[PDB]
Motif scaffolding. Structure first.
Motif, PDB file in Angstrom:
ATOM      1  N   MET A 196      -6.517   3.161  -1.604  1.00  0.00           N
ATOM      2  CA  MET A 196      -6.844   1.880  -0.988  1.00  0.00           C
ATOM      3  C   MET A 196      -8.188   1.928  -0.278  1.00  0.00           C
ATOM      4  O   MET A 196      -8.887   0.912  -0.208  1.00  0.00           O
ATOM      5  N   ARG A 197      -8.569   3.089   0.253  1.00  0.00           N
ATOM      6  CA  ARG A 197      -9.837   3.183   0.964  1.00  0.00           C
ATOM      7  C   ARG A 197     -11.024   2.982   0.032  1.00  0.00           C
ATOM      8  O   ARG A 197     -12.074   2.497   0.467  1.00  0.00           O
ATOM      9  N   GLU A 198     -10.881   3.342  -1.243  1.00  0.00           N
ATOM     10  CA  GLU A 198     -11.965   3.205  -2.206  1.00  0.00           C
ATOM     11  C   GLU A 198     -11.813   1.997  -3.119  1.00  0.00           C
ATOM     12  O   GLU A 198     -12.796   1.593  -3.749  1.00  0.00           O
ATOM     13  N   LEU A 223       0.839  -1.187   0.000  1.00  0.00           N
ATOM     14  CA  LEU A 223       0.000   0.000   0.000  1.00  0.00           C
ATOM     15  C   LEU A 223       0.878   1.242   0.000  1.00  0.00           C
ATOM     16  O   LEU A 223       1.793   1.364   0.820  1.00  0.00           O
ATOM     17  N   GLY A 224       0.598   2.163  -0.916  1.00  0.00           N
ATOM     18  CA  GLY A 224       1.446   3.325  -1.071  1.00  0.00           C
ATOM     19  C   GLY A 224       2.830   2.939  -1.546  1.00  0.00           C
ATOM     20  O   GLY A 224       3.835   3.336  -0.951  1.00  0.00           O
ATOM     21  N   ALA A 225       2.891   2.151  -2.620  1.00  0.00           N
ATOM     22  CA  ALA A 225       4.167   1.633  -3.096  1.00  0.00           C
ATOM     23  C   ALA A 225       5.113   2.735  -3.549  1.00  0.00           C
ATOM     24  O   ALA A 225       6.317   2.487  -3.669  1.00  0.00           O
ATOM     25  N   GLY A 226       4.608   3.936  -3.804  1.00  0.00           N
ATOM     26  CA  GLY A 226       5.485   5.002  -4.255  1.00  0.00           C
ATOM     27  C   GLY A 226       6.152   4.628  -5.562  1.00  0.00           C
ATOM     28  O   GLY A 226       5.495   4.220  -6.525  1.00  0.00           O
ATOM     29  N   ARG A 227       7.474   4.761  -5.606  1.00  0.00           N
ATOM     30  CA  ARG A 227       8.248   4.448  -6.798  1.00  0.00           C
ATOM     31  C   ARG A 227       8.729   3.003  -6.825  1.00  0.00           C
ATOM     32  O   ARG A 227       9.515   2.641  -7.706  1.00  0.00           O
TER      33      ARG A 227
END
Ligand SMILES: Nc1ncnc2c1ncn2[C@@H]1O[C@H](C[C@@H](N)CC[C@H](N)C(=O)O)[C@@H](O)[C@H]1O
Ligand SMILES: Nc1ncnc2c1ncn2[C@@H]1O[C@H](C[C@@H](N)CC[C@H](N)C(=O)O)[C@@H](O)[C@H]1O
Lengths: 10, 6, 625, 625, 10, 6
Positions: free
Chosen positions: C408-410, C352-356
């Protein structure tokens, strides 16, 4: 480089 | 801002 | 490198004096602008009608030389706090004249003696000057560590020196400074030139002087011991104090005469250089933080803002965080997948929030080394990070990694995740709304799923910092509530500060949250014993986290992760400084509140003296959901 | 060097393209962030679900390279002002996406086109982007000097061109720009990148353009002529325009293809270098002013506050002023003292505000060259300057000089003065209360005395410049009226500005004022013809003074004294820019009010559009007295 | 310069 | 400040 390379066009 | 700030 | 200067009270000529000082190796010269013995009258004639020049011309040295090579000293006969009206008025006039002349020369700094219990009139004159003209010059108060009244020899028959254990009688010098600082409303142009005596006070006092705006340290030549070779040296405690000051980056001013007449004066300076070499080289963290020490920055909020490429680039420079994430993932995979099921069992891992993509690379490496099959999703809401992730996936990862460009929330996942790995930890544990995002993502986690980080806690610790308070006060943003800067947290390196107590836990979060109640509003109360009798300026906030079982990651000073430099402590300012005594346990209260659309913190101190509730209803600082 | 860049819209691979560009000698590359032909949808189901990456990742380049080497371009297919709702919405979404990606890469600048008249929606989108998050990417609007519709050849039978002069029709492109920056509220992050094109417009149009905030200039390779040797060259008008642009420190962007295939592309850049060199080297004044151009600084007020040593030092760097003063003194001494009286006749001379003594030295040297006997009274209020004068007087100065430490308005001279010398002239004629001080000093001037400052007159000239307007707007500070910055004059080296008319005299003062009722309040009205549509932004102010006879110090551009860099022009801003059309007359009014212990100016433009009186009652600017 | 020039005094 | 400015 070349002599008068930048001389104006006539 | 190096670290965790702007 | 160390910058040092010379202190002189006699200068028959300026050119030759500067030449000799430079030859000796000093960087600047502290000199009197006016002759120290040349008393001047301003009211009573015929004294005030004194003809001729009042001091040496300013044309002797070029403007560049004045601006860098000279530091002015106030004349010794000026006593603005004398008990006689005539003397007081003459002292006021003389001080104004000398300060104006120093401004005329453009001196970089001006040394003012501070050696009396009461110096209110001096503060008034100085602050009046500080509000007249341009006055770019700085002011250094020469305040002794130990008052002369305490270090005088006991050689008077009927005036015995005090012998009682006056624990509070050894801090009086600091009080002298503190009071003077208050009268000048913590002016940014007033600093301290600490003067080191032969005898040092208790360690708590020297800690006291940490966090004060010390610019110079004055070393008398009489404090140097003599080694068997006949050179000057310092005692071990003095050496430790000098090392601490060097770590604070003050300028050293050697004052006095050449007591070690057998050797050149420069020898003194040379010794300091030697100590400058013995200073242990900065570690990786110290080198990384070099430049932003005690520099205020607003904390990041990735939830509503989008980070630049350089932000991710600096994030990826830290190897410790990703190595520990890889270790935690590898241990979790080993625990979850037994050897007999190695070939047939495939674990679903969502980043989650993998960024780069550094977390994705860490997960892939952990799976490879653990030799466990895995299918990986990478959820990321930032469209540009999504572009980079998609390029990575097409080039390197292949079908093993599925990129999702959704919050991720949606998002609605197609499969239940066996493991969810995320990094949403700000300087404070839950500063970046990690709890909200993770509780939103929990809905697609397996009943036996695992969440990395497993748990995280935040810690608060009271801190005193005149410099930090001054910088916060200097953050006045026009077009805003005048006192809003004090109601928002900042991330700072806290290089120059005093910590009044050990940090204590503030808030704790754990995932996945199986509790039928799912609420993040929290209320905490903390008691901090105080043993220093100082002034409280704010609260420093750290955090710790358990990624999986033993694998932990922290920035708390006692358990700071070695080498890790991805986070700086957060700072919660207080509107007004609060004085504290040897008792007077500090009672503070913290609230974490939300309204389904914003999240904010409210904090207030209830003991020893109450204070206003800061940032009520997210009035001055909120994090958008 | 001359910062030059290359404009490409086909970049198959960044690495080799940048290598080739750097080899050719360019400094930056202007490229599209997204593929120019890769249309993207955001509201159509089959299209919006397009898989795969949308553009090449930022990992291809180091973060430094992105921030310095690359300049983003907007995709050609984006038309935010399209008549079709679907196309307009798609263009809005695509432009927002591209701007966000450019911010993510941290590009130093982003290039957007202004090829059509109507750009309201584009301006709205750009403004919305600017007020969203924090980023520093500048925006360059590509605006041709000649509109595309006017540059097309006469090939169409049914739509022939016209040879009408169209004096008002040559400015249309500027209008496109002027509206756009008006919509975005003169944002400091918007700049022009004008395209030269093959043919230049009327010289007035170019002069108007040069007043705008031009950051780049686009040179198509098709405008270069071919010389007899086959190399590219520019016409005389193009060369003059290039010289003028170079004087503005603009960034040149070569665009197009190598038409002179026989030579190399670098041949173009080399030619610019040949133009970069051989241009008129900066004069003494230009070199002096370098670093202070379009930089607003408040005027000095020596009467109220004392100057520093550095200020007096820089005053001394100008030899022309003191040479002229010496010449005036020489002429006056020769005229007043005949040869038969060259001895036994000592002329009493007074220098008021002697400062550090350059005027006194000039007077002494003038007396020596004139071979006449004199006696000086140096008057100075600044106590530090008094100290410097006294030290200079004790040696190298006989008894001739008599330093006096008092305000000339209060000093009681023991002897009447044949001459009085002063240099209280400011950027404006009487910005430093020279009239008041000279009127006060007149009481001790002989009946037939001479005032070397003689006469001085101020001149005003309307000027338009977006740079100065933006800078003065940025000068807004807290703790005062938000419009105060527009009601005070600034001393500025006007560099990027356009002058709308010739200066006209504003105020005149002469000394001594032997007439009764000596009053300094004044009221003036000035009408300025205008020959081009423009946007008046302020009034530039100069001064011209006659010292004695035939000796003048001038800073007005038409008769600027050579090498006179002591005074910069003054600027009187108007809070609202005033649009002016060809043939209109700008009618402005100035008041100089000298209420007791206070002095200030009030200005207001009455035609063609009235404006509020600026600085009423000196609420925003006063000279103090 | 001298060997052990900065050795602590004792 | 140079020239006549501050
Ligand atoms: N609610 C959310 N849904 C999806 N992504 C989010 C959400 N909140 C934050 N993010 C993303 O999480 C990422 C945070 C991380 N990149 C921080 C550094 C971390 N070491 C990493 O590279 O993964 C950013 O790309 C954010 O856009
Ligand atoms: N009312 C006044 N009475 C006396 N001195 C004044 C008064 N107003 C201004 N001055 C002085 O006038 C001086 C201005 C000149 N120094 C300016 C430069 C000039 N080239 C010079 O050196 O004389 C300053 O030193 C001021 O202190």
């Amino acid at each position: 480089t070349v002599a008068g390379q930048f001389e104006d066009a006539d | 801002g190096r670290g965790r700030g702007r | 490198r160390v910058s040092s200067g010379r202190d002189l009270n006699c200068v028959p000529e300026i050119a030759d004096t500067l030449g000799a000082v430079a030859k000796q190796g000093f960087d600047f010269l502290c000199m009197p602008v006016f002759h120290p013995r040349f008393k001047r009258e301003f009211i009573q004639e015929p004294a005030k009608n004194r003809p001729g020049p009042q001091t040496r011309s300013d044309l002797l040295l070029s403007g560049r030389d004045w601006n860098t090579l000279i530091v002015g000293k106030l004349s010794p006969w000026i006593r603005p706090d004398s008990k006689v009206e005539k003397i007081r008025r003459n002292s006021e006039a003389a001080m104004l004249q000398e300060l104006n002349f120093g401004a005329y020369l453009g001196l970089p700094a001006f040394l003012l003696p501070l050696n009396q219990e009461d110096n209110t009139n001096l503060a008034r004159v100085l602050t009046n000057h500080i509000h007249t003209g341009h006055h770019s010059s700085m002011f250094w108060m020469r305040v002794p560590l130990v008052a002369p009244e305490d270090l005088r020899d006991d050689i008077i028959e009927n005036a015995p020196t005090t012998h009682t254990e006056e624990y509070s009688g050894e801090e009086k010098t600091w009080m002298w400074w503190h009071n003077f600082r208050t009268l000048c409303d913590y002016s940014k142009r007033i600093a301290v030139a600490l003067e080191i005596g032969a005898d040092l006070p208790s360690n708590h006092v020297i800690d006291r002087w940490l966090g004060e705006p010390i610019k110079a340290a004055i070393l008398p030549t009489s404090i140097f011991l003599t080694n068997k070779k006949g050179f000057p040296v310092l005692s071990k405690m003095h050496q430790r104090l000098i090392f601490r000051l060097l770590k604070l980056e003050v300028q050293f001013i050697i004052t006095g005469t050449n007591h070690h007449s057998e050797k050149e004066f420069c020898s003194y300076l040379q010794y300091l250089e030697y100590l400058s070499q013995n200073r242990p080289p900065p570690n990786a963290y110290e080198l990384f933080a070099k430049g932003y020490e005690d520099y205020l920055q607003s904390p990041l909020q990735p939830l509503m803002d989008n980070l630049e490429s350089q932000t991710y680039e600096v994030f990826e420079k830290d190897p410790i965080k990703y190595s520990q994430y890889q270790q935690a993932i590898y241990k979790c995979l080993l625990d979850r997948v037994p050897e007999e099921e190695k070939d047939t069992n495939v674990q679903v891992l969502m980043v989650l929030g993998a960024g780069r993509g550094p977390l994705v690379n860490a997960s892939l490496r952990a799976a490879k080394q653990a030799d466990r099959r895995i299918k990986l999703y990478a959820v990321e809401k930032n469209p540009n990070a999504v572009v980079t992730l998609e390029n990575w996936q097409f080039e390197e990862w292949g079908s093993q990694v599925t990129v999702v460009s959704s919050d991720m929330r949606e998002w609605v996942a197609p499969e239940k995740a066996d493991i969810i790995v995320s990094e949403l930890l700000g300087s404070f544990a839950d500063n970046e709304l990690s709890p909200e995002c993770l509780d939103g993502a929990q809905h697609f986690l397996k009943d036996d799923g695992v969440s990395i980080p497993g748990e995280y806690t935040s810690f608060l610790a009271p801190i005193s910092s005149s410099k930090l308070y001054n910088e916060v006060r200097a953050c006045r943003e026009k077009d805003r509530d005048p006192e809003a800067q004090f109601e928002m947290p900042y991330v700072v390196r806290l290089h120059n500060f005093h910590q009044l107590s050990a940090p204590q836990p503030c808030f704790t979060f754990s995932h996945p949250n199986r509790d039928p109640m799912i609420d993040n509003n929290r209320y905490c109360t903390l008691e901090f014993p105080v043993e220093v009798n100082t002034v409280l300026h704010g609260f420093a906030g750290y955090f710790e986290t358990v990624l999986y079982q033993d694998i932990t990651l922290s920035i708390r000073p006692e358990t700071h992760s070695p080498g890790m430099f991805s986070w700086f402590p957060i700072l919660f300012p207080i509107k007004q400084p609060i004085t504290v005594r040897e008792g007077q346990t500090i009672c503070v209260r913290f609230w974490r509140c939300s309204n389904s659309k914003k999240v904010w913190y409210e904090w207030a101190v209830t003991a020893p003296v109450c204070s206003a509730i800061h940032n009520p209803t997210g009035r001055s600082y909120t994090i958008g959901l």
